Design a protein around this ligand. Structure first.
Ligand code: A1CNZ
Lengths: 99, 99
């Protein structure tokens, strides 16, 4: 749906058979999730933000249902304060900014 | 305009008679800009993100023209890796997420 920004643009996501809330973040190039058991192989990685940097596990080809729209892509898992859906996954469900 | 997310949603802003490029970030509640000389009084403040926290100068009632749309609101100035337009100003120009 079309979402106003008077509140945080949070949506319900399905990933690894698990129900979570994530932030539709146009300022994030990648998707980062709080710690979870995501199945498959991974490769260490590091991502930076306003506060500095955090170490994450990079998992490629992960299925994620975002508000009912399906997408497959890289999902990073690490000590993020919040689950953020980045542009890597937003492009797959056809999200756009409109003003 | 309508903006797709295959590339970073960067836009041109005018603040303090000075031209800059900023990221339209629906994941940011407020606006933070890299170091610049903005006129007036300010108030120290702590803001947190991925990696931790940074100290910034808070400027209230600041005018910003974002891609031709004018808005007035609080602008934080500090060691951000990139200029971010947060939800405080995105709502002023009528931005929405659509999918
Ligand atoms: C985490 C999120 C909940 C909030 N952040 C917004 C998020 O969009 C940021 C933006 C950014 C930041 C730095 C560099 C480049 C982009 N991206 C992000 O960390 O993304 C990461 C994963 O992808 C990677 O690519 C980009 C970076 C990597 S914030 O900036 O920490 C923030 C927090 C509190 C406040 C504000 C801002 C305004 C004042 C207060 O309201």
């Amino acid at each position: 749906p079309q979402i106003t920004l008077w509140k945080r643009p949070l949506v319900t996501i399905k990933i690894g058979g698990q129900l979570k809330e994530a932030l539709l973040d146009t300022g994030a190039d990648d998707t980062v999730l709080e710690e979870m058991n995501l199945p498959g192989r991974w490769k260490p990685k590091m991502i930076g933000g306003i506060g500095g940097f955090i170490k994450v596990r990079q998992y490629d080809q992960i299925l994620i249902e975002i508000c009912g729209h399906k997408a497959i892509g890289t999902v990073l898992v690490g000590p993020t304060p919040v689950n953020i859906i980045g542009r890597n996954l937003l492009t797959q469900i056809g999200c756009t900014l409109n003003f």
